Amino acid sequence: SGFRKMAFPSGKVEGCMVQVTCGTTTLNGLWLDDVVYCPRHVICTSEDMLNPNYEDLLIRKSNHNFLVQAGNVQLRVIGHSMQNCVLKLKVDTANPKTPKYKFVRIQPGQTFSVLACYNGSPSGVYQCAMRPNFTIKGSFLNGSCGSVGFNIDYDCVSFCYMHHMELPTGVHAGTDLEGNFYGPFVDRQTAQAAGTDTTITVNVLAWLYAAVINGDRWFLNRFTTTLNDFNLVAMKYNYEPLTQDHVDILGPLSAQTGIAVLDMCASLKELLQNGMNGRTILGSALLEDEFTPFDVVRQCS
């Protein structure tokens, strides 16, 4: 029993983290096979940041301008190329610690673990969700760019996020491992801001089911709702609209507990209306939206 926000064991990713330096810029890279992946803004100077011409800056670079450092070992860069916002550094030796891996691009609402790193060295690991506005609410200091987010399935690491920058509001933006940003963001210091954040409704419902599975029933009620009536209400609380696909995703948990999805939706509407009234659910005084339907079956009985 019990319910914690749980990250994946970080060992397989720890064995891939290296340090990458251009002039006075140092950040992290991901060393898989004979390729080191990192953010391309490592090649900028602070004078470039406003309107960097990345292709012009890269053409001027030589292999030996890139110092890659794995532990004590300096790695020899034998080639370099650019794919979208990610720099790809060919090195002369394959990482022996390379795990089974794949690059995946995730959807808002999906969760993953972050291995926060500085100077190629892991600082800590924590569990995150991609927000509906395509940012993540991470914990990132200067030097953290190139830290990656991942899930692990059996023994295969799926890389889904690389950290690139912190927006002025204090949240974080980055790319998949093919260098395409999540969201309408670009890697230059120009005015940009995320959409209004919203609550990940399907994740909240999944978490209410987890609470029922662990024995809390104090928030259930006798009501049911239509999908459209629920969305009309939830959106007035800045909750994401719920789709029929979300309703189908919740099938298993609704079966396992004997509570229809639109019954649970009625409970959610009432919680938004009344609050918690001094009580908690799985240890939170707030409705938690960073557990997926999949995570709930993962952690739960």
Catalytically active residues, by annotation: 41, 145
Sequence-distant (6+) residues with CB within 8 A of 207 are: 281, 282, 287, 288, 289, 291, 296
Radius of gyration in angstroms for the set of CA atoms belonging to the chain, rounded to a whole number: 22
Among 34, 48, 166, 229, binds ligand YSJ (CB under 6 A): 166
What residues numbered 40-69 form the site for ligand YSJ, per CB under 6 A?
41, 49
In the complex, the smallest distance separating the C-beta of residue 186 from ligand YSJ, rounded to whole angstroms, is 8
Residue type (1 letter), 288: E
Q: Near a copy of itself by CB under 8 A, which window of 36-44, 118-126, 224-232, 255-263?
A: 118-126
Measuring CA to CA, how many Å separate 83 from each of 67, 86, 150, 187, 274? Answer: 20, 6, 20, 13, 50
Q: Which option in ligand YSJ, a copy of itself, none does residue 187 bind, with CB closer than 5 to 8 A by kind? A: ligand YSJ
Whether residue 55 contacts residue 100, with contact meaning beta carbons closer than 8 Å, is answered with no
The size of the interface with ligand YSJ (CB under 6 A), counted in residues, is 20
In the complex, the smallest distance separating the C-beta of residue 26 from a copy of itself, rounded to whole angstroms, is 12
List strands edge to edge, sheet with 67-70. Answer: 73-75, 67-70, 17-22, 25-32, 35-39, 86-91, 77-83
111: which 2 tokens?
């969760």
Q: Which stretches of the chain bind a copy of itself, using CB under 8 A? A: 1-12, 14-15, 115-119, 121-126, 128, 137-144, 166, 170-172, 214-215, 280, 283-286, 298-301
Q: Which stretches of the chain bind ligand YSJ, using CB under 6 A? A: 25-27, 41, 49, 140-145, 165-168, 187-189, 191-192
